[PDB]
Design a protein around this ligand. Structure first.
Ligand code: HEM
Length: 422
């Protein structure tokens, strides 16, 4: 009903404050995002942009203010979408990441068992084995792209395990997720073909339905239930009939794959980029390997794989000396908050023994705090544990290529030369 090409981004000092548009999906790639958000934090921490390709929106850029917006779901709704823009027509799917309580609470309870700490503990052998195997497969006499060989490879195996997806088809979960999460209308991503998105959403719905029916058929034949989400959903009375609720069914399954896809991937890659910019931290790590758990938090803080989550004001809200109007879109820029010097001293430095590194907001805060935070930290810890066993040095031999997006902060190309230890 009713009615992106890259260009050089100018110095933020050349702009009136009302003309700063941080929805530009090239701000991260071009390294301008730090100066743009710092100007916002300093002089417009609750900022209204009237004109953007996504329409008007508020930017909330200070750590303390983002906490308030994220935790106050009675003032700022997560519905109906948490990306800055809109999904293409015909591709809206309800996910509980874009739902307020109580309904958010009910839907998250039906899937949260898949990351139960007892289950993650039991899967450590498999994760570490996969993490050992891919690392042993990497060449040490020539450089290679770390993104497909390591980050995406380990991420895709993990996603397959989570759903018991056919392993040989796991590349499909990632390709579908990338196209869906990289919609030009939603995040300024490079996917602008609505035809391919319609084909993906149909292949994906058909694939999840086949997986559901194959699993119930295997369970009816006596196969013991497992750790995966489908086994868990078919073991609980509330969700044993979830296929008869297609919106809930597709919504929960797509959220799990999109939630863990480029987040895990870009956190695996981003640690190497941070180490490259701050090489003394790798010597500190080698001499004190017990720093790995805290370093994982510092990698996640420094990388902030998801730059923001978006809300809609449910009423007029006074915040930062401004009046957010009912209905306005409000963007909580985690990428800015994690660089806020009011919260972190020396915020742009990668400091692996930073004592308050675990207080980052890359997972958000409030009822929507990332459900897979422990799963992500676990894979990242194991990754660096297995790196230290094998490699005395790691070299980035080319400027990393960063992904076009205002939402995902990640890398498509990371060329790495490995040096084994003695
Ligand atoms: C470093 C890794 C990760 C980061 C930075 C990250 C980031 C986030 C963020 C920012 C949110 C929303 C927070 C908010 O609105 O307050 C979120 C929620 C969510 N994430 Fe993650 N994520 C990561 C890993 C994962 C993984 C591995 C999975 C799946 C296994 C996952 C699945 C989800 C789900 C299902 C939600 C919805 C939670 C809810 O609405 O209650 N995430 N994540």
């Amino acid at each position: 009903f009713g009615p992106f090409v890259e260009t050089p981004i100018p110095d933020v000092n050349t702009l009136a404050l009302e003309d700063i548009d941080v929805s530009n999906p090239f701000l991260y790639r071009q390294g301008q995002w730090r100066a743009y958000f710092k100007r916002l934090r300093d002089e417009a921490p609750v900022h209204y942009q009237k004109n953007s390709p996504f329409g008007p929106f508020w930017s909330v850029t200070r750590f303390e203010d983002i906490l308030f917006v994220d935790k106050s779901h009675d003032l700022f709704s997560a519905e109906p979408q948490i990306i800055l823009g809109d999904p293409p027509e015909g591709l809206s799917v309800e996910m509980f990441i874009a739902m307020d309580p109580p309904k958010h609470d009910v839907q998250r309870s039906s899937v949260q068992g898949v990351v139960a700490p007892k289950n993650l503990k039991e899967m450590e052998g498999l994760i570490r084995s996969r993490t050992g195997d891919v690392l042993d497969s990497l060449p040490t006499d020539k450089p290679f792209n770390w993104v497909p060989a390591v980050s995406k490879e380990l991420t895709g195996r993990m996603l397959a395990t989570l759903l018991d997806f056919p392993y040989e088809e796991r590349h499909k979960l990632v390709e579908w997720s990338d196209r869906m999460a990289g919609a030009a209308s939603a995040t300024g991503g490079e996917f602008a073909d609505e035809n391919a998105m319609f084909d993906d959403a149909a292949d994906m719905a058909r694939s999840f339905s086949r997986l559901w029916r194959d699993k119930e058929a295997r369970r009816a034949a006596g196969e013991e239930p497992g750790f995966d989400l489908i086994s868990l959903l078919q073991s609980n009375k509330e969700t044993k009939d979830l296929i008869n609720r297609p919106m809930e069914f597709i919504g929960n399954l797509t959220l799990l794959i999109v939630g863990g896809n480029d987040t895990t991937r870009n956190s695996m890659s981003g640690g190497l980029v941070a180490m490259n910019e701050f090489p003394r931290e790798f010597e500190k790590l080698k001499a004190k390997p017990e720093l790995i758990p805290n370093m994982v938090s510092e990698i996640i803080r420094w990388q902030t794989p998801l730059a923001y989550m978006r809300r809609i004001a449910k009423q007029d809200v006074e915040l930062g000396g401004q009046t957010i109007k009912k209905g306005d879109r409000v963007v909580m820029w985690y990428a800015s908050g994690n660089r806020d010097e009011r919260k972190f001293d020396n915020p742009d430095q990668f400091i692996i023994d930073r004592k308050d590194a675990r207080n980052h907001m890359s997972f958000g805060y409030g009822v929507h705090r990332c459900m897979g935070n422990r799963l992500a930290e676990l894979q990242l810890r194991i990754l660096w544990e297995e790196i230290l066993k094998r490699f005395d040095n790691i070299e980035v031999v080319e400027e990393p290529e960063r992904v076009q997006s205002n939402f995902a902060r990640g890398y498509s190309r990371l060329m790495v030369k490995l040096t084994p230890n003695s």
